[PDB]
Structure 1
């Protein structure tokens, strides 16, 4: 089997992407944030504290003839941005782009943090990291991909995120029309539960490539590119007037600037992030100070190849017995 679904930016900055997901019988379609940095499929629901729902579409398990309470199971998650959610668990039928999993754990939120409430466009998350990170207790549950894998034509999914435009998540096949040149594959460590890999270096603009190993994670659920402070300083030094602002929370730059590109290495291959991908617009409405899309990972404890990086590539998440990651230009 295969599946193919379009993923759409939630706003004009590509702050996140939402993908429609069918849950239950009859189908209830929710727009979920596909997150390769976590491993829980959780949704706003009829169980979510009423004051914490503000415009989201909810899953109502009592209206699904295939929903079953997973007795005694609870979940609770905290994300790297300080947001969180928790609740109980149903199993139900879940379909993405024509690919169906029966008996998928659907984690129903009883509580969500303010950042989730305040984002009316995201109805929940669909985790695509390794199932070892799943938070369901006392019996850990599998991701949608892990459940689908054996049935797929090939045990892979691909992320093709657009810049200020829709893109695609495919399951079970590689669309050879969706990228240019070849796909370069690179090793993955699953030791921390992530799609963790090592970039071979970087360049800023038309500058020379610096060969240096940068361990980090391919994370579709993180907006920006978080890299070591040395790398980030080298980038922003090429933008007149750019500075790190403790009060804003990262590098800012004059909105009048033209940003240089940023290149990262995948083995001997190179992925080029155009400068415009690094612009996250005014820090507040009407400001001439703009927020940068490349930020320091210092004090995160891990480097994160988030959407800023991934949307410059066609990315293969290869879930073979020994997982790997592939990157192609597009």
Structure 2
């Protein structure tokens, strides 16, 4: 039975986490994203100027083309990418998927052209939302799941320290206490769950649903919750240059917690200080608006506090405080 550990590393201010992945012999640095189901990589089919500063996959060396197959994806921040498809061998933390669909980029939007920190994305959401046409493909996890000791993966994302992706086993040394599990609704292809209540510093409110998403930097909540939070932060103001609410970096921020099937997941106020807003001298908050979409995005700010288990049996998610 297989199992493996892949080490992730945060970029500046923990904007994203990258992990090495070997595709057909070449190692690429990918962003593992539990909010999408496509594994796409920078490739030799991009214009040479766009290949600059990245490790690129060359489909000709080792891939088997899926004649007539395309992909096209749009994300929540407006970025997009498209191209064609090959099958190849993909290895992550020593677990190899043979015949895994690899989506070679032919076009990428500016957000991706500007980021030289990643060479593409490895999607870990449910395969039902894979964008490959005319027939959707399976995610690396779905491809190998049956070979793993347990059909699950776990994540520990940290603040300015390397963390891990555990595939096929749970590392009990990564959290304190026991895990608490909650049911997952995968009908829209996400790792979606419910919270029964929330506490934003001195205020509490009723529950809502959200998705566990390693591909989103911040904790994105309803505008109502965001207002309530920042009403308790002296001098907090919105700065469109910074991307949302900002405050003096020395501010004491309140904690944020959610109650999930009896377990209180707490994000300490020190983790809600994302970092320098880059707009003078203020800092950007880790909590920002979800733009009225109707559900919350439990992104990296939230995940840095927890060890999270993504279990295909249920499905369900397990949580515990990171050790």
Give the drift of 1:45.
0.8
Tell me the alpha carbon deviations over residues 87-142 of structure 1, each in whole angstroms, 9 at most, x when there is no partner. Answer: 00110000100111100000000111111111111000000001111010011100
Range moving further from structure 2, 311-320 or 45-54 = 45-54
Range moving further from structure 2, 110-119 or 291-300 = 291-300
Asked if 1:251 corresponds to 2:249, the answer is no
Flag structure 2 segments of 5+ consecutive residues without an equivalent: none
Alpha carbons 2:101, 2:137 under 8 Å: kept: yes
TM-score (norm 1): 0.93
Asked if 1:46 corresponds to 2:44, the answer is yes
2:315 is aligned to: 323
1:277 is aligned to: 271
Alpha carbons 1:14, 1:163 under 8 Å: kept: yes
2:165 is aligned to: 169
For residues 1-330 of structure 1, the aligned pairs below 5 Å read 1-11=2-12, 13-24=13-24, 27-64=25-62, 67-205=63-201, 207=202, 210=204, 212-245=206-239, 248-284=242-278, 287-320=280-313, 322-330=314-322
SS at match of 1:132: helix
Cα distance in structure 2, aligned partners of 1:204 and 1:9: 26
Cα distance in structure 2, aligned partners of 1:291 and 1:54: 30
Give the drift of 1:28.
0.6
Query: Cα 1:247–1:162, aligned 2, differ >3 Å: closer, same or farther?
Result: closer
Tell me the alpha carbon deviations over residues 234-287 of structure 1, each in whole angstroms, 9 at most, x when there is no partner. Answer: 2111210012345644211122312222112221111221222112223226x1
Give the drift of 1:211.
5.5
TM-score (norm 2): 0.95
SS at match of 1:277: helix
Cα distance in structure 2, aligned partners of 1:126 and 1:267: 29
Give the drift of 1:82.
0.5
Query: Cα 1:129–1:165, aligned 2, differ >3 Å: closer, same or farther?
Result: same
Flag structure 1 segments of 5+ consecutive residues without an equivalent: none
Range moving further from structure 2, 237-246 or 222-231 = 237-246
Alpha carbons 2:222, 2:292 under 8 Å: kept: no
